[PDB]
RNA sequence: ACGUUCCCGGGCCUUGUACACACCGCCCGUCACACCAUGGGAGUUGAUUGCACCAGAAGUGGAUAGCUUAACCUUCGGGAAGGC
C-alpha cells in the first residue's frame, strides 16, 4: 500500500508464506548457515521482544540468553535465510514492544503464557 | 752535706682495682667503608574473613490460569485420587 504500485507489484512475488505470531512469545527460527561446501540449519530459540510488519519488509528481533549474557538477532520475515518459524511458546504482553526485558536478566525476565 | 718537701729508682706494712704478657694495663662513644637481621615508612601486591544486601538452578512444601486422566466409587454424564 505504502509503496508505489509498481513496487507492489515486485513485492508480491518476493512474499512467502509463514506461520503469523504475535509478540512476546517464545519461537525457534531455522537460520541457513555455511560453513563452506556443506549446508546446515540453526535453531535459534527466543522471546520476541519486537516485531515491526512492514509487507515484505517485516522483521522480528529475537532474544536469548547465552552463557549468562543476552544475544538479539533482527530476523527478517521474508527472508529466504529463515527456512522455517514456529512458535514453541505463546505468551500475552501489554505492549508490542519489550525493551523492558534488556535490563531484566533472570526472574523477572519472564513472560506470562497466554491461555 | 741545715734536711726529706719534691724529679728518679728501690725495701717493708696496710688500702682500692673492671689489671694479670700485669698502667707501656684495661676500656667508652660519635664519624668513615663494607656485609647481616631487624623497626617506622607515601605505597604496590596476595591469602583468609565480619556484616548488609542482590540472587534463585534442582529438590521438597502451600495454593490452583490450566492440561492428560488404568486400578477404587459411578446414575457410565462423571466424582475420588494422582501426575504435569
Known sequence: SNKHLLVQAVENAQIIERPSFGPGDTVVVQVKVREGERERLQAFEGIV?????????????????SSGVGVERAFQLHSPIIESIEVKRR?????????????????????????
Request: charged fraction near 40%; hydrophobic fraction near 35%.
Open 49 to 65: 521482544i519486537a516485531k515491526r510488519n512492514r509487507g515484505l519488509n517485516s522483521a522480528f528481533t529475537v532474544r536469548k540468553i
Open 91 to 115: 505468551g500475552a504482553v501489554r505492549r508490542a514492544k519489550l525493551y523492558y526485558l534488556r535490563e531484566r536478566s533472570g526472574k523477572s525476565a519472564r513472560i506470562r503464557e497466554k491461555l
